[PDB]
């Protein structure tokens with residue numbers, strides 16, 4: 001019996017990782033469980049096109065054809081029509097006109113300014129597929145949904161003649177997350193990092209950028225007495241998002257002191273070194289890191305297998 005504690009910031013992928021364990025070692029998401037996620041996939045898409053809409057307002061963006069103005073109005077009229085997984089085709093057509101319009105797209109490339117779900121461009125492009133009345137979410141659709149994680153989430157599976165209990169803490173509040181109870185002991189920690197988060201944009205109240213806050217969280221998690229012989233596994237996740245982001249936005253955004261160039265590999269190893277250098281601990285406590293795209297069931301599968309061989313080597 002192995003104990004995996006799943007720790008990360010917000011929107012870091014932990015529910016995506018749990019959903020991946022249920023896919024990979026459990027039987028996976030049956031059609032019924034997909035059908036439940038119908039309404040999630042819907043309201044994710046709606047809140048997301050709404051998000052970009054409202055942010056056209058504050059970033060001062062216009063609609064490529066002003067014909068879209070009333071389309072905007074109609075959105076908010078039928079925003080709740082999809083309460084019960086019923087996307088009327090009127091609602092569909094509105095979301096398509098809006099997403100296809102230029103100015104909406106301009107605000108969306110600005111994206112990093114107004115904060116919007118990572119799986120937005122996904123559903124929004126594949127909207128034709130989704131808008132069928134009889135559409136069933138693909139497994140990748142369920143993996144793309146953001147449901148926000150309430151209390152303490154648990155998962156039991158078996159792998160390689162070994163029982164595993166995984167716990168997503170979530171908690172939705174950085175101090176409610178305290179739960180040092182679970183902290184005591186624990187086979188292995190899985191700290192998850194939203195790479196794509198470097199270039200995000202400081203809030204008014206926000207002291208440091210998201211990336212730095214996560215680094216502090218990791219520094220306290222690793223350099224903890226409870227996790228001395230805990231195996232520490234860092235997922236530098238959303239490598240796909242981050243890989244896309246380096247082209248348009250420099251890593252100088254997050255770390256200013258970075259004199260290396262804005263390429264995938266340099267920036268990725270520099271973030272890696274940034275996190276790994278927080279460990280003041282022994283040479284017996286060497287952090288194990290992997291770069292990861294948690295929505296890729298195959299990528300996860302392979303990573304997690306190398307992870308288990310690590311955890312085994314400790315016992």
Ligand SMILES: Nc1nc2c(ncn2[C@@H]2O[C@H](COP(=O)(O)OP(=O)(O)O)[C@@H](O)[C@H]2O)c(=O)[nH]1
Pocket residue numbers: 008009010011012013014015016017117118119143144145146147148149170237238239240241292293294295
């Ligand atoms: N496109 C993409 N989305 C990801 C990746 N990893 C996680 N996500 C998405 O990130 C969003 C936040 O993940 P979530 O499961 O809520 O993480 P949590 O905050 O730790 O519970 C979800 O919509 C996931 O679908 C990735 O590598 N690529």
